Every structure is written in structure tokens, then in C-alpha cells.
Design a protein around this ligand. Structure first.
Ligand SMILES: O=C(O)/C=C/c1ccc(O)cc1
Ligand SMILES: O=C(O)/C=C/c1ccc(O)cc1
Ligand SMILES: O=C(O)/C=C/c1ccc(O)cc1
Lengths: 513, 514, 514
């Protein structure tokens, strides 16, 4: 199993690898040294009785109640207690671990004061096959979910195995070989702080979107091979005229997908010189409908949105979103501010959510065109096999895709719903965790719509080019053959619900390569 | 000596707005003029050779399978403008309409549209005049309809707008502005009715307005701290470094600068204080401010980063060729057919910026709600009234009005998610970018009104807290209040504020506090 | 001989619109005049007895804890109107502003507001004039602000509007309308600045508009069936009886009536046909129409039931007393303090109606989308063009415009869910009913434009299918097309349709196809 050495910076791929259990995690010596130095600084702050939130004060508006050193253990224990008011389905295994990792990366910068033991508890969890069982709702953007995490790590909360099966606190510590979290150093705020939950949810969203984006491209390409699509619309020259990075990338990836294909139309229409005799109505127009012709532009805009989201998220993931914080340079004993305000993830998650809904709509319209006997240039209605009428093929699945898209559209941005709370102390809140969660739901819906499109295209390719897929590009052939290893052709109507669900799960974790 | 913007290949957003607003004249650089002349020649050849090209030898949309004889091209393109002129709704404002014209011009200047010298000159003339075409704001799915209306205007068959929004009939417009009627005899109509000009023009005006409102958001947040004994340590650079989002670092830096020299803010780092047994108890105030002050860098910062992304994308779009079909300058092929007119980029960025604006307007609204609350404003009069309490309510009405404006902003969401297959299913996916840009503009206008209310409240609060002399107020804060007081008197007794709010809002959208 | 509406206690929605639109004068019935005179006296007694009453012996909002001495009440109420005049945004249109005035009047007529005879006369005089107060549309969280602006107008300190929307200053309004300046010396200002008058006025105008648009939605659906050989069995009464929703039953019955006498629709019940062995195979067409025709009763019906609910609630609101405080006519107590001003009823019904309007607008848009599609319109020209195809595109632009208008409608959601605590947390929950009603109105306007496009398309389609003589077309269908053709010529060749769409839309909102 590969290992990710965490020093100061970790990229999104490395983060997902650790969160997903694909890689172990190790704290590099430099990071351990910085953290040990921060641990010492917290010790000094405490010995000096400096006025520091959480060390000598109550919480929120109650910070005006100063606390004596002898009562800090109780203080921080009750912090975790009152914050554990979360409700709703627990975060999935990968996401909960991504949250744990997000808190760890912040701590690794060396300004949180976390003790070596506390850090070890986070590392141990990530190297185990377990995840804390944390409720998904309750935060306005992430004290509540992190408090639940703390309780779990103390053996006072459930754990999740890779399959999602729940284990009680005691069993989790035993099975994962985890030691109970001990906060005797008064470093509880190093664990209950920042934007860890929304950041964890967001990095999982990022990974899923990369794979779905690859599928969106690969299916658009296969669509072209099933409907005699025109490749000139995907020409590099057009990209150069409207140089959006995401568009250029999309167009390039589309051209690569259909390289070697004999099923697409490559002629440049303007090369044709017309004669008087040609004047009249031709069978087909010289350009395709937008679901093919404008794929670079639509996909590209979505890709540029994801690029922005990922740039912002990379900074957030590697930042210290803690409050208070302890300056490594020792300029002041501690700083008090609001780096826990998750507005960055809130806004990027909302923007990505819109992009996902837009790209899902493209896929949905691609299915709608491919299955329409009036628009699919000669293919069977709904790509059925067997006697028509007696069989409807993908007619149900097509409507299901529309249903999934319509549902996605009903939910909008989470960020615009800030409500003054906490006795007006938190008079503005980010709702970033909700934003990231709403984006995740759309991503899941998009995966299902793409799954339906994938199943439709495997059938359409065979109906158009025969089981041998004559004229189909090497990439298209590889994709269909891969699908057919687990999903049989539709020779007669059958229930597709379970296959759609199974395929969607795959699309979210792997690309067509 | 009005400034001049020489257009060649690239033009930045500030230059673009200078031309659209009439602050600068525009000229086509010699290299651009030559590239355009070369493209003009290519179109001529394409037509002479009877090449199969959309709009030159074919119908439009799904009717493109209907080929057209060269003898009827004049009619073909004339009816294109005719059938597309189905727009409705209020006309785009003067600056925005001109921004659309500019956006089409910049695309043409790249030299791949085949536009004739006369056509280009007609666009430049409009931009150098004091006029703007009167074009309906609704009708496009993202921008043939508004552009077709523009064409009719430039032909004297449509109204024009003066800087005030007053309409002039076509003939009067060409006359007053010394504009020659647009002549499409060269069959270059597709150079004018194409691309994402409308949404791009609307968005470039949005970008400019947001820069100014962002500056007011920072300046007012700073003045708020001076009126509520705000703590500056939350805006420390060290915190920005720990969470290095560019927008946040900038917001914090600008906030610190605004209060530089102030004796009204609390600058002590609370952690420097060493506590002893006698300190253990309940203090009057907590050691940190409520989020509307403490988290300003993070909230404003996220908004600024969204605007930064919006502008990066918009800059590329403005300087791109969103035409279809296009005529490659290298001459590799007679023409290319694709979909560079799909405005998904402006659609998604406008929607993202709209959300950011709603979030920042919410911050300003909560700042007003805190400042005017006698239980939260640390000693200031309820609703900052003057005169006997009760008999006077001060800004009580204005405060509720700010909330009402914010609530309305929240009712409208992203435009992009509503794509609907249309044009006989040929345009099965559409961007709705023009709608997206327009919805963002509306929120920007509401944000300006909310900031205007906050500004008027702060001018009053500063005097109530520090005396008419503003003792202890920062140099920047003093200058801002003094400037406001030049046109907006103190509220000594209750009076209608509606007109003043609207007047100030107009100002905030065009100038920053300096 | 201008009709007259005599107000006593109850007025229906039609009478209300008749007065608001100036189609009828308004007179106060003898019993209403007496109830009001008695209430006026009760207000006098409350003041004489120094009863603890909001607005008479107290400040406003959270400032009500500040008690006021009788000698300062004139000033108290004057500043109330002053601080509340913080409205911004475009003014309410002539009819809607008058509807607001009427709403306040009807509440007062119940005799629990204490309004003096003069105050009542000022409202009546305004309604019987050709003017309306010029009132900003934004500023209320749900309607003190718009009503305060109304008060200023009636005192000659605010603008007025003529039927065309042209603005007149305060002096000119009082002069031209032959109105007396409003005098609040009786300390009855709270009888004018109170309740839900603005949202109720906006909503009642919405109700009238929806009735007409609904009639057009039915008429055009029927004409669509005559243009596409629609099957009438889907509109049979038997189906309505099996699923007894009132709105659906009514929709089906109105549809059948519209096509009565038509020889262009298919009336054969498919199940009557017995199939033989040689019938098995693929028929040209399916035995049932697409949903835009087959499910018209169900879709239109659900919208009609929503409007019915909206109207039932609105009727109660219009004829209710939404004031605070109130003076019990039964003399049980001097006054009651509560929250009848909370416009949650109009907020929720406006939001529900807005959704229904968007759904029905969607139906019309899809009907246009089907009718103009050569692959779906059963033999009609692509986009219903005349003249050579390609060279002409007909309604291709208008069809896209319809889609764009619908997409914009969808971007805005319910206003009610955005309640934000305001007024120093005193108004911790607000209705936003005024905003809700306004958002619904905008959707209604978009719906009218979409229906206008459909109407123009259908007139053309009817002539293309049945010839200029409309052979086989029902009497109702013929009347509608002929009526349209008196003002809107056929589209024999492509031409700008924007102005015609807008003109027709204006007509559809005020008159039904009869
Ligand atoms: O203002 C802060 O830094 C603290 C906020 C807070 C709000 C609710 C809690 O349950 C804990 C902390
Ligand atoms: O597919 C295209 O390139 C053309 C689309 C189009 C749609 C509606 C119009 O009115 C004109 C062009
Ligand atoms: O609570 C009330 O009845 C008064 C509310 C109110 C709020 C804002 C105003 O400007 C006037 C009255």
C-alpha cells in the first residue's frame, strides 16, 4: 500500500487516496517537529495564564465568562458535550475520514498546539479501515461533526467499517487497534475547529467530478459514433478562437476519444462548392444539434468551474482554519479571528453544484436524443431489441433520467440562506457544509444519469455497428467491451434499476481508460 | 483630451468599461484593421466560390438543410434580422447596450468574422458617439435576438438611447450622432448577429459595479468597527497567511488600511494579557467581536475570489471570437462550423457571482441590523435616532427596508440550471447566460441600495459616537463621512429617506470611497 | 354612465378590480358611513381617556416602551410617516397603487380603525379620480412603507400617476384630481399606515389577470387541437367525473365548449373500433395525443384549483381588518393589540399561484414548441413560415423567445421562505407577502407574453391548415382568429414581432377571448 508523507502540502489526489484507504499516511519529520514546537507553545500559553478563547474562557457569547485553570478539563469536556447535537444520516466512510484528514492537515502546519498523542490518534484512524460515525447535519459552517468525531475517537461513539456497517465505540477501538483519545493537554480546540467537514466532503466531490467528467467526455464521443456526429465542431482551431482552458481541454479529449473512428463525419462542410442543381432541401443539416456540436463549450464551462473549485479547495485543505491559533514565530502568544468561516467552500460548492446540474442536463438531453426514433437517425425507438411494441427497451430508463435531473434542479445554492444565530454572535454563517453536501447529492444524481447514458450507448453502438462494433474507435470499443463484461445487451426488456445503480457506483470511482 | 483605447487584439475589463461608459474613445489599431481587411477578402472568396456555409448558402437553425442560391443571400440575411427581432421587456441601459456593441466589435477585431470596413466603422462610430441602441432585454437563450435589434437600430429602423435613457427614433439617432446607416450589402450580417455579445456586455458592467461595491463593503465594514469599538486583531495579516486565500488576504489588508490612524478601534491582542485569580469572573464584553466584524475578511474574501474568477473568465470571453461560422485567418479551410456561441462560461460565472453578491449583501444587511439595535450597538441610540426617543425612530424604517431588499435578492436563484430544449430540438441545450448576467445585475443593484443604507447609518453613528468633529475617527473614515455629508445631511429629526437611499446607491455603483 | 360600487361590508374581487381600474366609482353605504363615524368617536374617547394605546401614547416597534404625552402625538404620528418613507424601486403601476388604496379603505369600512370622515373621504376622492399615488414598490417585509409614501402623496408631498404612468408632482396631483390635502389632525394616521394593503392590492390585480390568462390558455389549447387534429375524447366529461377535481372538470368543460362545432378535431372514441387480423402492425399515428393536449384538463385544472384557493383566501383578506391596534365596535375593550398585519396568507397564496403560473406557462411554451416543429406539427410548415423556406423562418425567433421567457420565470422561487429577523429582533418573523405578490405578478406578465406568442402562432397555423377562410374551424376559433387579425396581420414574410408580442400581451391581461 502506497504511503503519503504529510509535511506542509498535500494535493487533492493524495488526500482522496488517504481518505479512501488506498494509501497509508505518515507525518514527515519536519511536520512532527513543527507540531512539537506548537505543543510547547500551548503549554507556555497555559502556564502564563494568557487570555485565550477555550483555555481561559467560555464559548461563543459565553466567552465573557473567564475560567480558572483548574476547571479547563471540564470546560473542554463540556464543549465536546454541548456540541454533539448532530442529527441525520452519518457521513459515508470515505467522507468522514476525509474530514479527519482535513483537521490533521491543518494541525500539521504547526499552529494548533495539538499534542503528539492527539495527532497520533488522527493518523491511526486514517491508517485503519475505520471511520468515525458522524451525523451529517447540525453545523452552519464544523464544530458539531468534529465534536461527534471526538466522542467516537474516545470510544463514546460509533465507527463505520468500509461497508458502512456500524460498530460501537468499544468495538471500534478494538477492531481498528486505536487508543482512546486523551485530551489532558487541553488541546481539544485542535480537534473541534475549522472547516474540516465541508472540506472533507468537498475533496470527495472533487475526485468524483473528475471521473464523471471523463465519463461525460467519453459518452459524448461514443454518442457521436452512434449518430454520425461531425468532428469539425470539435476542431482545435475553434478552441484557439475562444481560449477557455476547460473548453480547449474538452475539445482535445473529445477528438482523442474518437481517434480511429470510421463512424463519425470528419469532412469540413465549407470545403463543398455548391451548384445551382444542389439548391433545395437536403436530407440533413450541415451541423449537429447542440448536445453534440456545443459539447466542448458546455463541458468546458463545467471543467473551468471545477478547476476554480479545486484551486480554492486546495488552499483551504492546506490552510489552518483554527481559532484561536498560535503563531509559530512567537510574535504574540495567540491570535483570535475567524478563519473557521467556511465561505470559500460554500461558494465554490454552490458554483460546482450549478455546473454539475448543467452537465447532467447535457447527458439527459443526449439520452433523450439517442432514444428518440425521430432524432436518432435510423436507430430503433428507445433502442429496443425484439418485436417493437412488445418491447420498449430503454423507454423507462430514459424517463428515469429526466426524473433524476428534474430533482437535481429543485435544490439551489446553500450559501444564500445565512441566518443570524448563537444569540446573534454568529450573525452571518457560511453554510459551507450544507453546500458541499447538496453538491454531493447532485454529483450522485449525475452519476446515475451518466450510467443510463452509458447503458444506452452500449446498446446503440451494437445496433448501429453490429456486435463486432465495426468502424468504432479503439477507445469506444474498449469502453463498450468493458461495460459488456458486467452488463449484458438488452435483447428483451428487463429491470434496469439495479444495473443503473451498480454502474453509477463505478462511474464515481473510475474513468474510461 | 478624452482618453483613447486602441483596439488590436486584447482589451482589459477597465478599458472595455471606459469605452462602454463613454469615458474613452475607441480606435482600431492598424494591425487589426489589416487583419479585418484580410478576413473581409476571405468572406468575399467564400461567397464567390459558393462554399456550403451557414448563413451564406443555407437557412437558419434546423432550416439549414434548405440550401439558398447566391442570388437570394441579401433577402436571406435581411429576413434573419427580421425573424430574430422578437425581443420584449425593458431595454438594456445605455452603458450595457454599448457594452454589447463593444463585445461584438472585439470579436470581429480578431479578424475571423469577415466583417466589412463599413460594418466595423458603424460599430466604432456608435461607440464614439453619445448614443446607444435601444434593445429589449428579454428573448435570448444565450445572443441573436438582442443583436438583431441592434442591427435594426444601426440601420435607423430602431430607437436609440441618450445617456439619460431618453429614446430617439432611428432617423434622429443617426442624425444627432452622425452615424451612417448600416449597410450589409457585403453579406456580412452574421458578423453582427452572432456570439455572446449581450451577456458579455452585461457581465462587464457587472464586473465594474462589483469592484466599486466591494470597495464600499470594505470601507463601511471598517467604519462600522470605528463605531462599535471593533477589534483589529481579527484582521491581522498573520491570520491571512495561515489561510492564504488571495481574496481574504486582500480584504484584510484593505480593512487594516481603512482604520489606520483610528483611535476608535481596539488594537490590543487579547492573548498578551496574563490573567490572575482576581480576573476570574464575568466581563462586560467577550474578547472577540460578532462575525459581521470578526469574519469580514473571510466573507468578503470569498466574494472577492468569486469576482476574480468571474473576471478571469470574462476577460477571455470578451477577447474571444464567439462567432459561427468562422473564417480561419491561416486559410487552412474556407470556414469552420462549431458552437463557440454557447455562452455557458458567462452563464456559470454570472450565477456564481450572483450568489456571492447575495452573500455579501447579507453581511451588509446584518451589519445594519447590529448597528441599529440598541441592545447590540454598545450605547448608541436605538436606530441611531436624534431628537426625543419615541417621537423619533431614526433609521428604523430604512433598516427594515434593507432586510426587505435582501429577502427579495434571495428569492431568485441561478439561471443556468433551467436549460430547455428548443428550436425544434436543435438547440436541445442552451446556456441562458444573458438571463444569468441580468439576474446578477439585479442583485448588484439591490446590494448597492443596502450598502447605501449602511453608509447613511454609519455617517450618523460616527457623529453620535464621536461628535460632529469625528474625534478619534481614522483619516479615511473622516474623509468618507465628510464626503457623504456634502450631499446627505445628518438625521436630526425623522424624514423620508427613500430618495436619498436611491441617489446614494447610484453613486456607489460608479465610484469608490477614496 | 360610469358604474358605481357601493361599499358596506363585503366587496368581491371583480368589484375591487373595477374600482381600482377606474371602471367603476366607489361610494360608502349609509351603514358603513355610520360604523365609521362611531369608530371615529371611539378613537376620540380613547385619546380623551388617555388609554395605553400603540401609536397614540407610545413609540413604534421596540420603541413602544417609550410612553408619549398627548401634546406630542401630532409630532409622533408625523414622524411615523416620515421614518417609514424609505421605499425604493419602480413605483407600483396605476391600477395596483389604487388597489392598495382600496384595500386600506375596505379595512377601514369595517369600522374598527378610528379613521375620521375626512381621511375616508380622501381615499374615496382618490379612487373616484383618474389618479393614483406614486409609490415605490420595494421596502416592506409585509405594508407600512408603501402606505407611508401614500400618505405623503395624499398630502401633496409626493408624486401622483395618471392612467399612462406619467408622473405629476404633489401640487399638480391635488389640482388635476381636484383633491383636498390629507389632514391627520384627528390623530388617525394609524388608520392609513397599517395592514396588508399593498400586497392585497397587488394580489387582487394578479387575480384578475390570471382569470383572463386562464381563459386564453383554454382558448389557445382548443385552437391548437383544431390545428393538429386533436382528439377530443381526452376532454370527455366522463374522465372529469372519475377524477372530480373542480378545476379539472371546469377546464375540460371549457375546452369542449371552445371546439364545439369544429370539424377539424377528431371526436371518434378509439375503443369503439374493433380490430381484425389485418390490422396488426404499425399505424401512422398513435391513438392518443401528446400530453400538451391530452393532459390539458389535468394541468390547467390544477392551476385553476390553485387560483380558486388563492382567490378564496384573498377575498377574506381584502374584506378583513388587518390593522393594529383596533377599536372593537362592540365596545368590549378600548382597543386590542395583536398582529393581524402579518401578511402570511397573501405570502403563501401568492407563492402557490406563482408556481401554478409557471407550470401553466410551461404548458403554453411546450404547445408553441410542438406546433412550430415540422417533425411534430403533422404537415405544417417549419415554424409556420410563409414564403420560401429557409429564406423565411417565420416564428423561429418568437419560439425561442418563448423558451427564454419561461426559463427566466423558473429562476425565481417562493418569497415566503426568506423570513429574516429584523427591527432589532422585534419583527423576528416576517411574511414578505408584498414581495411574494410582486414576484407572482412578474410571472403573470411573462405568462401573458408566452400566450401572446402562442396566439400569434395559432392564428397563422389555423390559416395554413384550413385556409384563410378557416374551413372546418369552430365558431369560437373563427371568432378568436378574426379578432386577432383585425390588429395583427398574417406573417406572409418574416418581420420583427417584438412590438406585436408586447402589444398583444397587454391585451391578454385585460380581456378574454369572447
Ligand atoms: O464566536 C465564536 O468563536 C464561538 C462560537 C460558538 C457558537 C456555538 C457553539 O456551540 C460553540 C461556539
Ligand atoms: O443551430 C444554429 O446554429 C442556429 C440556431 C438558431 C435558432 C433560432 C433562430 O431564430 C436562429 C438560429
Ligand atoms: O411591532 C410593531 O407593531 C411595530 C413594528 C415596526 C417596525 C418598523 C417600523 O419602521 C415601524 C413599526
Amino acid at each position: 500500500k502506497p504511503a503519503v508523507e504529510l509535511d506542509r502540502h498535500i494535493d487533492l489526489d493524495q488526500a482522496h487516496a488517504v481518505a479512501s484507504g488506498g494509501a497509508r499516511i505518515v507525518l514527515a519529520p519536519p511536520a512532527r517537529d513543527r507540531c512539537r514546537a506548537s505543543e510547547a507553545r500551548l503549554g507556555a500559553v497555559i502556564r502564563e495564564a494568557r487570555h485565550v478563547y477555550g483555555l481561559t474562557t467560555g464559548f461563543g457569547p459565553l466567552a465573557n465568562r473567564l475560567i480558572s485553570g483548574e476547571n479547563v478539563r471540564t470546560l473542554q469536556a463540556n464543549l465536546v458535550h454541548h456540541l454533539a447535537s448532530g442529527v441525520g444520516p452519518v457521513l459515508d466512510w470515505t467522507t468522514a475520514r476525509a474530514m479527519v484528514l482535513a483537521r490533521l492537515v491543518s494541525i500539521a502546519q504547526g499552529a494548533s498546539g495539538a499534542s503528539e498523542g492527539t495527532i497520533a490518534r488522527l493518523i491511526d484512524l486514517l491508517n485503519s479501515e475505520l471511520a468515525p460515525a458522524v451525523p451529517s447535519r447540525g453545523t452552519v459552517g464544523d464544530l458539531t461533526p468534529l465534536a461527534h468525531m471526538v466522542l467516537c475517537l474516545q470510544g463514546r461513539g460509533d465507527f463505520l467499517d468500509r461497508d458502512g456497517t456500524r460498530l460501537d465505540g468499544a468495538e471500534g477501538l478494538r477492531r481498528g487497534r486505536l487508543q482512546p483519545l486523551d485530551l489532558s493537554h487541553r488541546d481539544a480546540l485542535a480537534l473541534v475547529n475549522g472547516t474540516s467537514a465541508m472540506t472533507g466532503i468537498a475533496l470527495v466531490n472533487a475526485h468524483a467530478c473528475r471521473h464523471l467528467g471523463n465519463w461525460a467526455v467519453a459518452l459524448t464521443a461514443l454518442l457521436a459514433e452512434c449518430l454520425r456526429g461531425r468532428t469539425e465542431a470539435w476542431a482545435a482551431a475553434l478552441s484557439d478562437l475562444r481560449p477557455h482552458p476547460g473548453q480547449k481541454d474538452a475539445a482535445a479529449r473529445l477528438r482523442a476519444r474518437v481517434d480511429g473512428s470510421a463512424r463519425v463525419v470528419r469532412h469540413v462542410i465549407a470545403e463543398r462548392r455548391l451548384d445551382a442543381g444542389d439548391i433545395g432541401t437536403e436530407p440533413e443539416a450541415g451541423q449537429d444539434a447542440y448536445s453534440l456540436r456545443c459539447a466542448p463549450q458546455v463541458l468546458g464551462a463545467g471543467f473551468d468551474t471545477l478547476a476554480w473549485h479545486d484551486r480554492v479547495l486546495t488552499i483551504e485543505l492546506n490552510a489552518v482554519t483554527d481559532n484561536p491559533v498560535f503563531p509559530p514565530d512567537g510574535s504574540v502568544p495567540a491570535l483570535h479571528g475567524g478563519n473557521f468561516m467556511g465561505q470559500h467552500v460554500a461558494l465554490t460548492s454552490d458554483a460546482l453544484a450549478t455546473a454539475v446540474t448543467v452537465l447532467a442536463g447535457l447527458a439527459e438531453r443526449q439520452i433523450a436524443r439517442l432514444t428518440d426514433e425521430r432524432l436518432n437517425r435510423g436507430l430503433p425507438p428507445f433502442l429496443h431489441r425484439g418485436p417493437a411494441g412488445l418491447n420498449s427497451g430503454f423507454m423507462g430508463a430514459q424517463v428515469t433520467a429526466t426524473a433524476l435531473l428534474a430533482e437535481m434542479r429543485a435544490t439551489g445554492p446553500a450559501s444564500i440562506h445565512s441566518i443570524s444565530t448563537n444569540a446573534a454572535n454568529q450573525d452571518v454563517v457560511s453554510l459551507g457544509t450544507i453546500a458541499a453536501r447538496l453538491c454531493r447529492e447532485k454529483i450522485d444524481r449525475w452519476a446515475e444519469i451518466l450510467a443510463i447514458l452509458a447503458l444506452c450507448l452500449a446498446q446503440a453502438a451494437e445496433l448501429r455497428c453490429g456486435s463486432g462494433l465495426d468502424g468504432v474507435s479503439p477507445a469506444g470499443k474498449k469502453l463498450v467491451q468493458a461495460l459488456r463484461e458486467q452488463f449484458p445487451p438488452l435483447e428483451t426488456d428487463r429491470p434496469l434499476g439495479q444495473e443503473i445503480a451498480a454502474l453509477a457506483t463505478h462511474l464515481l470511482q473510475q474513468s474510461p481508460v
